[PDB]
Design a protein around this nucleic acid. Sequence first.
RNA 1: GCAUCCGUAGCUCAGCUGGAUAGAGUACUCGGCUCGAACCGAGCGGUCGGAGGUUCGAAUCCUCCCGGAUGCACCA
RNA 2: GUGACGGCGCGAGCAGGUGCGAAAGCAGGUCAUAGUGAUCCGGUGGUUCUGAAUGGAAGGGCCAUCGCUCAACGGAUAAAA
RNA 3: UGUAGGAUAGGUGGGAGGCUUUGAAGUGUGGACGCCAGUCUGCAUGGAGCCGACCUUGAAAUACCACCCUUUAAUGUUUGA
RNA 4: ACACAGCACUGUGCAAACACGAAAGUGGACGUAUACGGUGUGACGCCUGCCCGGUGCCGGAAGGUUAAUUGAUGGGGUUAG
RNA 5: CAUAGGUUAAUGAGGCGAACCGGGGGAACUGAAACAUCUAAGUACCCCGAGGAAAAGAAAUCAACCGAGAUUCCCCCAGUA
Lengths: 77, 134, 52
Amino acid sequence: SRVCQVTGKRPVTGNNRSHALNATKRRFLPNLHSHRFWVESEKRFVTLRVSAKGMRVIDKKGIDTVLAELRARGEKY
Amino acid sequence: KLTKRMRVIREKVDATKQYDINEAIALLKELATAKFVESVDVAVNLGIDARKSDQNVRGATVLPHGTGQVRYRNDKNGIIHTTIGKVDFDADKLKENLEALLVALKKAKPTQAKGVYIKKVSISTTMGAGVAVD
Amino acid sequence: GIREKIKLVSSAGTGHFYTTTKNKRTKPEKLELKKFDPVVRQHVIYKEAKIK
RNA sequence: GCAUCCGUAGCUCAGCUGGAUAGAGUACUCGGCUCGAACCGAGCGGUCGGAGGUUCGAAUCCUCCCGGAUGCACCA
RNA sequence: GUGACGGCGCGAGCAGGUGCGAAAGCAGGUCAUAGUGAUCCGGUGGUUCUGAAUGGAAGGGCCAUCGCUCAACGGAUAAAA
RNA sequence: UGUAGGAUAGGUGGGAGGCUUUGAAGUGUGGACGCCAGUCUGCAUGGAGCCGACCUUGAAAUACCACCCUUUAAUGUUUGA
RNA sequence: ACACAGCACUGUGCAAACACGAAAGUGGACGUAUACGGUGUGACGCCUGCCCGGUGCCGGAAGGUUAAUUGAUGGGGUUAG
RNA sequence: CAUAGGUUAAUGAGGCGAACCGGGGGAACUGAAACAUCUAAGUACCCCGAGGAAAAGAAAUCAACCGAGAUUCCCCCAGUA
Ligand SMILES: [Mg+2]
Ligand SMILES: [Mg+2]
Ligand SMILES: [Mg+2]
Ligand SMILES: [Mg+2]
Ligand SMILES: [Mg+2]
Ligand SMILES: [Mg+2]
Ligand SMILES: [Mg+2]
Ligand SMILES: [Mg+2]
Ligand SMILES: [Mg+2]
Ligand SMILES: [Mg+2]
Ligand SMILES: [Mg+2]
Ligand SMILES: [Mg+2]
Ligand SMILES: [Mg+2]
Ligand SMILES: [Mg+2]
Ligand SMILES: [Mg+2]
Ligand SMILES: [Mg+2]
Ligand SMILES: [Mg+2]
Ligand SMILES: [Mg+2]
Ligand SMILES: [Mg+2]
């Protein structure tokens, strides 16, 4: 499903608000993208379904550090 | 190109940066380099522009130090070029002279004016460079 | 209705004003009247202005 | 409720682009010549939408309005 | 006085400042009766009224005043065959 | 560049200064721009001249220095196509 | 009446248009413009005239207008002094 | 080389069940004497998970220049701001 493997972002629901303030239910989904991250330690490419916000944290946190947390989460990358 | 007389003038004044009244008047007294006694020449630029008819200003001021009654009228480029007095006047007196001019100028400002009334205040002598006043 | 409402502002600077109407086709000149000003408790000249 | 722009022979428009003082085509008169067509050149037909600000210099720039237009705005 | 009410209308007289008269006096619009739109919301000016710890301020209140052929005119909604 | 002109005076001042082996003026078209009037000026050119400048000009002058604007030619920069 | 073979217009170059599906995917089609979808007409015979102003569709893109976005600039509040 | 994958062996989970609880989704009738904002209502319902309770919980909380000192529940404050 539409779940970020790094940040855990999932679809959320809200309202379409018109000029007349009419409210209709809608959904906000994350900006998810399948990316192949190069992990140096295994000299391999590992594909992750990540949001655009998740991509930014990968640079800050390092590819190896996030995967260590992922194994703790048991997400089965 | 520039002669030694002109190059020493720009060596004494570094107008690229702003100066305070106390320092500015000191520079003016050291800038007096001419055969004949010089007169302070005011170089005050107003943010307001006289391109609007109703924003024109005409005023007068009597100075105790003297130059003692002086008049002034804004030009088209919205700049003020008056004279507070002779260069041989004491620094402290000259500061009072220009200050009295400045306060009268504030009264003359119209409400219609927009922006920083006094855009820049500078002082210069006959052959001296323009020193900003703060 | 084509006559437009105007306000008459006191010259004393109190900020009190009266309101009335005036004909724009004729009488272009500004309206000047001596009217009582409640703030200064005196009769002063009122000058035409713009409602805004 | 603002913001901008336009207004010039009768007409259609250059605006004599922002002051160093009106141009064309058309409308009309005469002429060139010629049955009308059709062609040409002169002349005539405008104080420049109106009123206030400057300066020696504005139809042209500033203020104010009038009419027109396009925009936005807009939940008494 | 007239209205169920919201309200509308008439008013001598009093205070402060005026105008016209020499004065008595008259003048709180027009010979009178039509020329009109409640509340909410928003805009403008004024104000030692308020100011979420205190000093300000925003905002609100009060005063002045603006914006509906809300004409189906006591006006269902800002918005409808 | 209103014009007048002293006219390549944009305006604003100070302004009898200006001027000056640093090359007196200066010759060689150096060209550009501009009124195409004129002007500064590329390197040499020679060797003491050089210049405020009245009628007029609003003003007094690319004599003069300071300060702005306009016109902007090029220059890096910062954003875009 | 509907369908009908036939006719015409139009879309569709194949990861086709289109349709069912939040999506994956499937049908279209294991087909490829002599194909498929949609629309109107309705064998055959003789024929299908004029109008692009209105409303749609298609093509054009110079100009006018115009969102998110960027935040020049100006105005206020506060106060070190 | 590794990795994916594959075969064994150990544990654990699967489902059911009244209400209560936390979380993920989430109406409309109705009221407004119509009806869109609003109300109904985060209710009905669907889904996930847990316990005997759950949830919450040890101040980046409130106060007002005095102080209080985690969370939960009841009565007031108050149908007040
Ligand atoms: Mg709803
Ligand atoms: Mg409303
Ligand atoms: Mg009297
Ligand atoms: Mg009468
Ligand atoms: Mg306070
Ligand atoms: Mg206040
Ligand atoms: Mg506070
Ligand atoms: Mg207030
Ligand atoms: Mg009625
Ligand atoms: Mg009713
Ligand atoms: Mg048929
Ligand atoms: Mg036909
Ligand atoms: Mg058509
Ligand atoms: Mg057409
Ligand atoms: Mg279970
Ligand atoms: Mg409902
Ligand atoms: Mg209903
Ligand atoms: Mg109802
Ligand atoms: Mg919820």
